[PDB]
RNA sequence: CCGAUAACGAACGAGACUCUGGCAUGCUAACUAGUUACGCGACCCCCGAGCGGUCGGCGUCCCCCAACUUCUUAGAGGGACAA
């Protein structure tokens, strides 16, 4: 009985849009991590046509842009891109404070810890490493890590039980500790590279994408497997509902709505394709946030625009 | 005009295709990053010529069963 | 101590020059050495253009050598006790090197 | 400090000291299978290094001749005394340098037999001792009044861009023989592999190597591995 | 009020000339070398490098301070390079530090009247060859 | 709005030909202040139709061997033209320039190696043709004479925008025309 | 206000600045100012009367302006295109003798003076009467 | 180059390649390159306005009596492939 309805657009930057980060302190702006060596900073005033307008411009890095967060309190944001290196902004006129010199090829994931104190990062040279806030690495994790590239890289969002997730194309989920940065679960079951991970607000259960199509759970306090369910082609991004169930994934261009007490579709959310001249596949979607309410998605799409998709009734 | 690719472009694309169909796709920056890393190209316009011909080129496999 | 030296590297081959200069740089740092970085000095071209025929027939064609020199700075805040052995262990036969006090 | 010389005329008279002692080695011990020279200078006693095929007897009778050469090395270059030293070391692989093989053309020449069978004999030592290609050529007059010129290639040989600056290498020699001179040309391509000494390093521009896959077995059901 | 800090360098090129603008928050004062823009080389040019402020109006730079330092080129390439340098000086001093809208709106306006104004002009010379007077003109061929 | 060199409002002048407005860039968008750019516009071909007209004057003027990157010259030379023109008749400089253009583009040429046929001319070619062809009257006439190459411009515009088969402009376009008649 | 010589005009500052100098006779002019040629590069020795005293103001300009310059600095300053009858033309310099006057006759009116370097350079003196014909010379104009 | 095919598999030349031009407010840096800021010093205006204007005047790495690299230099990388 619950359908989504897009509200209009995001117009304002000429890039692949690869990320957006969404705070729960101050829900008025958002974050747009695209393929223009740009961050933007939105100010989502809920008009007619002008439902977000960019605000200020967040330049500095040297190639694309791969990720994007936000800190707690929503004053700092950290961003790391394909020039190899990280980057922590900050608000009020957004300079940016610290760079993390980092890995010798280039990032793909960023991480805030539950206590905005540890920085991870996830990156093509088939290493990670968590960092100091101010820009030193602790130690970088080596030669148990994946053997392929290091896709996206997640914390629990609990203090409770630290745990650090990270997929990559070597087809394995790899978690890691925080204790020690020891290895303790070594999942296998996917047959192509990964793109995404996410866990859940309860650190309890972990949803992984790729070029499977399966958007495939697992579970974190025992940690064994939990059931799978496919869904299209490539998936691109993977979020749950921050207050509620309903997890969503990005599969192609569109993205698909999935309970979890019962397996069924919820919805179908596509862009209305005008002019088929069955020659150019349609715009992928790249990216999924919540607004930490439940009540807006936020969709980042492979053409120069990002959708703002509305619950209805 | 006057952008033909030779068949060293040609036949290492062809190759490349081939052995590692399963880690590419129709984005020409991430073919660029594989084909950087499966393959000592020497020089970098050789490697993203070599990638713009794998892009094409899976667009094509896409569409239909080109050799292959 | 403390004396302030200045060392002077030439070369033509650019790689091989940076090189020695990274090594002494590095070395120098862990030594506990405050050091100014190396500073490239525009590089020079000496482009002798000839007429590329013994006899004068024929079309007028040229020839068009050139030949490059690199050059940087190395500035070093100790006395010539360490510093002289740490560059006796960089030679790289195509670097020509004075170190110079920077009263000179 | 005393006497002072720009860098610009500095590095030219250093290239002119090299050039110059080259030829006179080159002329001098041309019968011990030269090949080059090496120059390690040095603001002290500088090193120079001779890269002879034998060198038995580039060092004399208990290392006269090695002796007589730095006294007229130090004599002409106006060294003080002691601050040159003269070494000599044997080039591995002499079918690979085109010093070398011309040397033994025209020793082959001067002895006298078949232009065919000396450039034969010489190319084929060539390519088994591991030259991806190789071409000789010999001008001049050969049997006859007027003069013509033979290629004996083989293999593989590149002509053209900046990998022929370094991949492959030449040399040219004169024969005084009883009716005029001949020209000896050689150019031998040298192998890539081990990314050592018997060849170079980055090879070829236009060749791409593509490493294969390996097994990536069990995409089955899902398994979850502890620790 | 009296926030420090406001200032931007941007520069402009037109083939060897490269002028640097700093965008101070002031009130409206712009000067190159020293010396006003209506006291400027040879005055023929006069709109060519008025023609920003003539855009934008006077609104647009009442806030700002620009101070123009210019080497190299000819006179009219140092035209060309200080009027690329004070269009992108203000674009930059408007992006850093006020709304985002304002900067589209004086960058676009900037864009449908002589591109380059924001961006610069890529092309030039050409080497002299070893055959001609220059690079492709040859010298005259005679047959007989 | 724009109003190039301070006076000389643009938006009232008409090009009556529908086959010349096409190629005439005087309308509001065109709208400088200088008849001077760094344009590219020899990149590609019809570029040079959307270069003002202006521009494209004082480019032709520059022209006759010891003025050839002497533009400020030109740029001044048509200024002070248009100058006497506003002077001589009331009329705005832009329009009587542009009438100008429109009577002295010849519409009929012929060509052959075998002058065989009469064919038609492209509305660029004529653009070309009638800013060559005025701007070789008032060099002509300017040559060895007191009168400054200025007013020698200026009476060269009017006469053609009026017509008067006494420009050399219409002169040249009556006998093209002409000739062309004789083999159509 | 202002005003400095920067932001006014520089030839009608010339002009007003060698009326001044004019006006107060006490500037030293040689005896031959009537048989110069002023760099022999070109011919006709100016078509002026009072050309000594517009040049010492473009020196005094040019020194304001430009500190430290020399009689060789001038030469350069002075200098033009010698065409130079059927053979290409050249750069060449101007006349030293007029350079050298016309500064030791600045200097004789106290407002330039040898620094502590080569060269010379204007005097508080100097740059006070400079800045104070270039607020007459801009009022002049603007009103 | 695609294809066709009593030819198949190759080799040189072309292309690749090397140098140069154009872009990086991103990196590494610089008293033999500078820029901003500050403090002195000259002039202009003032009635006082003043964190006013000009300065290729001086100084701020003999150690804090300042930071920084936009402009200059040149290294590493990026960037364009008909994507
Ligand atoms: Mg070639
Ligand atoms: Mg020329």
Same mark, same amino acid.
């Given at each position: 009985t619950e359908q989504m309805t897009l509200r209009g657009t995001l117009k304002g930057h000429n890039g692949w849009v690869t990320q957006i980060a969404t705070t729960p302190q101050f829900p008025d702006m958002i974050l747009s991590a695209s393929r223009d060596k740009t961050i933007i900073m939105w100010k989502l005033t809920r008009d007619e046509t002008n439902y977000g307008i960019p605000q200020r411009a967040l330049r500095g890095h040297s190639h694309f842009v791969s990720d994007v967060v936000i800190s707690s309190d929503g004053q700092f944001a950290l961003?790391?891109?394909?020039?190899?290196?990280?980057?922590?902004?900050?608000?009020?006129?957004?300079?940016?404070?610290?760079?993390?010199?980092?890995?010798? +090829?280039?990032?793909?994931?960023?991480?805030?810890?539950?206590?905005?104190?540890?920085?991870?990062?996830?990156?093509?040279? +088939?290493?990670?490493?968590?960092?100091?806030?101010?820009?030193?690495?602790?130690?970088?994790?080596?030669?148990?890590?994946?053997?392929?590239?290091?896709?996206?890289?997640?914390?629990?969002?609990?203090?409770?039980?630290?745990? *650090?997730?990270?997929?990559?194309?070597? %087809?394995?989920?790899?978690?890691?500790?925080?204790?020690?940065?020891?290895? %303790?679960?070594?999942?296998?079951?996917?047959?192509?590279?990964?793109?995404?991970?996410?866990?859940?607000?309860?650190?309890?259960?972990?949803?992984?994408?790729?070029?499977?199509?399966?958007?495939?759970?697992?579970?974190?306090?025992?940690? +064994?497997?939990?059931?799978?369910?496919?869904?299209?082609?490539?998936?691109?991004?993977?979020?749950?509902?921050?207050?509620?169930?309903?997890?969503?994934?990005?599969?192609?261009?569109? *993205? %698909? *709505?999935?309970?979890?007490?019962?397996?069924?579709?919820?919805?179908?959310?596509?862009?209305?394709? *005008?002019?088929?001249?069955? +020659?150019?596949?349609?715009?992928?979607?790249?990216? #999924?946030?919540?607004?930490?309410?439940?009540?807006? #998605?936020?969709?980042?799409?492979?053409?120069?625009?990002?959708?703002?998709?509305?619950?209805?009734? | 005009m006057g952008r033909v690719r030779t068949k060293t472009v040609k036949k290492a694309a062809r190759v490349i295709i081939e052995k590692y169909y399963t880690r590419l796709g129709n984005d020409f920056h991430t073919n660029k990053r594989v084909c950087e890393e499966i393959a000592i190209i020497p020089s970098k316009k050789l490697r993203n010529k070599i990638a713009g011909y794998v892009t094409h080129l899976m667009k094509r496999i896409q569409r239909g069963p080109v050799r292959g | 101590a403390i004396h302030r030296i200045r060392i002077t590297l030439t070369s033509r081959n650019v790689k091989s020059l940076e090189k020695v200069c990274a090594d002494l740089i590095r070395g120098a740092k862990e030594k506990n050495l405050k050091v100014k970085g190396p500073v490239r000095m525009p590089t020079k071209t000496l482009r002798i253009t000839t007429r590329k025929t013994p006899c004068g027939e024929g079309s007028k064609t040229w020839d068009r050598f050139q030949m490059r020199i690199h050059k940087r700075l190395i500035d070093l805040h100790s006395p010539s006790e360490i510093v002289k052995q740490i560059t006796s262990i960089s030679i790289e036969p195509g670097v020509e090197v004075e170190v110079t006090i920077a009263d000179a | 400090m005393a006497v002072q010389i720009s860098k610009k005329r500095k590095f030219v008279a250093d290239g002119i000291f090299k050039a110059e002692l080259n030829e006179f080695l080159t002329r001098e011990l041309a019968e011990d299978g030269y090949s080059g020279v090496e120059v390690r200078v040095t603001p002290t006693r500088t090193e120079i290094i001779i890269l002879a095929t034998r060198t038995q007897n580039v060092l004399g009778e208990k290392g006269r001749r090695i002796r007589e050469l730095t006294a007229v090395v130090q004599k002409r270059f106006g060294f003080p005394e002691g601050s040159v030293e003269l070494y000599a070391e044997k080039v591995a692989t002499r079918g690979l340098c085109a010093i070398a093989q011309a040397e033994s053309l025209r020793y082959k020449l001067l002895g006298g037999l078949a232009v065919r069978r000396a450039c034969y004999g010489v190319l084929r030592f060539i390519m088994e001792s591991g030259a991806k290609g190789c071409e000789v050529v010999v001008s001049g007059k050969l049997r006859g009044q007027r003069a013509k010129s033979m290629k004996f290639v083989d293999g593989l040989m590149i002509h053209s861009g900046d990998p022929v600056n370094y991949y492959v290498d030449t040399a040219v020699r004169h024969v005084l023989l009883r009716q005029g001179v001949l020209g000896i040309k050689v150019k031998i391509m040298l192998p890539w592999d081990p990314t050592g000494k018997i060849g170079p390093k980055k090879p070829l521009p236009d060749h791409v190597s593509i490493v294969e896959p390996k097994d990536e077995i069990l995409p089955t059901t899902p398994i979850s591995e502890q620790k | 009020s009296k926030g420090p800090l406001q200032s931007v360098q941007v520069f402009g090129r037109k083939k060897t000339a490269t002028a640097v603008a700093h965008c101070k928050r002031g009130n409206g004062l712009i000067k190159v070398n020293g010396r006003p823009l209506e006291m400027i080389e040879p005055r023929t040019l006069q709109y060519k490098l008025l023609e920003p402020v003539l855009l934008l109006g006077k609104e647009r730079f009442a806030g700002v301070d620009i101070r123009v330092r210019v080497k190299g080129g000819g006179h009219v390439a140092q035209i060309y390079a200080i009027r690329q340098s004070i269009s992108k000086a203000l674009v930059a001093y408007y992006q850093k530090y006020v709304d985002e809208a304002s900067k589209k709106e004086i960058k676009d306006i900037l864009i449908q009247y002589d591109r380059t104004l924001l961006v610069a002009d890529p092309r030039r010379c050409e080497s002299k060859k070893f055959g001609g007077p220059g690079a492709r003109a040859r010298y005259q061929k005679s047959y007989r | 709005d724009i109003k190039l060199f301070g006076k000389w409002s643009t938006d009232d002048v008409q090009?009556?030909?529908?086959?010349?407005?096409?190629?005439?860039?005087?309308?509001?968008?065109?709208?400088?202040?200088?008849?001077?750019?760094?344009?590219?516009?020899?990149?590609?071909?019809?570029?040079?139709?959307?270069?003002? /007209?202006? &521009?494209?004057? =004082?480019?032709?003027?520059?022209?006759?061997?010891?003025?050839?990157?002497?533009?400020?010259?030109?740029?001044?030379?048509?200024?002070?033209?248009?100058?006497?023109?506003? $002077?001589?008749?009331?009329?705005?400089? $832009?329009?009587?320039?542009?009438? !100008?253009?429109?009577?002295?583009?010849?519409?009929?040429?012929? =060509?052959?190696?075998?002058?065989?046929?009469?064919?038609?001319?492209?509305?660029?070619?004529?653009?070309?043709?009638? /800013?060559?062809?005025?701007?070789?009257?008032?060099?002509?006439?300017?040559?060895?004479?007191?009168? =400054?190459?200025?007013?020698? $411009? !200026?009476?060269? $515009?009017?006469?053609?925008?009026?017509?008067?088969?006494?420009?050399? !402009?219409?002169?040249?376009?009556? &006998?093209?025309?002409?000739?062309?008649?004789?083999?159509? | 206000p202002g005003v400095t010589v920067k932001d006014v005009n520089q030839q009608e500052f010339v002009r007003a600045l060698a009326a001044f100098l004019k006006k107060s006779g006490k500037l030293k002019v040689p005896e031959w100012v009537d048989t110069v040629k002023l760099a022999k590069h070109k011919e006709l020795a100016p078509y002026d009367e009072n050309w000594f005293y517009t040049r010492a103001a473009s020196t005094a300009r040019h020194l304001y302006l430009r500190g430290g310059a020399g009689v060789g600095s001038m030469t350069k300053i002075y200098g033009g295109r010698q065409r130079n009858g059927v053979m290409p033309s050249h750069f060449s310099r101007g006349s030293k003798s007029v350079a050298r006057r016309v500064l030791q006759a600045l200097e004789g009116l106290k407002m330039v003076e040898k620094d502590q370097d080569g060269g010379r350079k204007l005097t508080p003196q100097g740059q006070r009467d400079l800045d104070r014909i270039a607020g007459q010379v801009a009022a002049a104009n603007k009103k």
């Open positions: 961003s790391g891109s394909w020039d190899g290196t990280l980057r922590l902004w900050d608000l009020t006129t957004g300079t940016t404070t610290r760079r993390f010199v980092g890995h010798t +090829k280039d990032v793909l994931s960023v991480a805030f810890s539950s206590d905005n104190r540890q920085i991870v990062s996830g990156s093509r040279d +088939k290493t990670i490493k968590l960092w100091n806030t101010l820009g030193v690495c602790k130690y970088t994790v080596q030669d148990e890590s994946h053997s392929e590239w290091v896709s996206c890289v997640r914390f629990s969002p609990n203090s409770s039980n630290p745990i *650090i997730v990270s997929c990559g194309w070597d %087809k394995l989920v790899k978690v890691w500790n925080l204790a020690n940065c020891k290895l %303790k679960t070594n999942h296998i079951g996917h047959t192509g590279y990964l793109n995404t991970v996410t866990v859940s607000p309860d650190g309890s259960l972990c949803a992984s994408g790729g070029k499977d199509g399966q958007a495939m759970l697992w579970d974190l306090n025992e940690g +064994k497997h939990l059931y799978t369910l496919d869904g299209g082609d490539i998936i691109n991004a993977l979020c749950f509902s921050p207050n509620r169930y309903w997890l969503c994934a990005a599969t192609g261009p569109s *993205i %698909k *709505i999935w309970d979890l007490e019962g397996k069924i579709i919820v919805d179908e959310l596509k862009q209305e394709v *005008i002019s088929t001249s069955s +020659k150019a596949e349609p715009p992928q979607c790249t990216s #999924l946030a919540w607004s930490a309410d439940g009540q807006t #998605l936020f969709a980042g799409y492979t053409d120069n625009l990002v959708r703002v998709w509305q619950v209805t009734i | - | - | - | - | 090009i009556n030909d529908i086959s010349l407005q096409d190629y005439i860039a005087v309308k509001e968008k065109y709208a400088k202040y200088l008849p001077h750019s760094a344009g590219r516009y020899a990149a590609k071909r019809f570029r040079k139709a959307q270069c003002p /007209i202006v &521009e494209r004057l =004082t480019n032709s003027m520059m022209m006759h061997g010891r003025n050839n990157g002497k533009k400020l010259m030109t740029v001044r030379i048509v200024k002070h033209a248009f100058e006497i023109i506003h $002077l001589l008749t009331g009329e705005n400089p $832009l329009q009587v320039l542009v009438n !100008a253009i429109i009577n002295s583009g010849p519409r009929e040429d012929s =060509t052959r190696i075998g002058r065989r046929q009469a064919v038609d001319v492209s509305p660029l070619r004529r653009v070309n043709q009638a /800013i060559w062809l005025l701007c070789t009257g008032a060099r002509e006439a300017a040559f060895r004479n007191i009168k =400054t190459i200025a007013e020698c $411009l !200026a009476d060269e $515009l009017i006469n053609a925008a009026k017509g008067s088969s006494n420009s050399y !402009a219409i002169k040249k376009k009556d &006998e093209l025309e002409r000739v062309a008649k004789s083999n159509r | -």
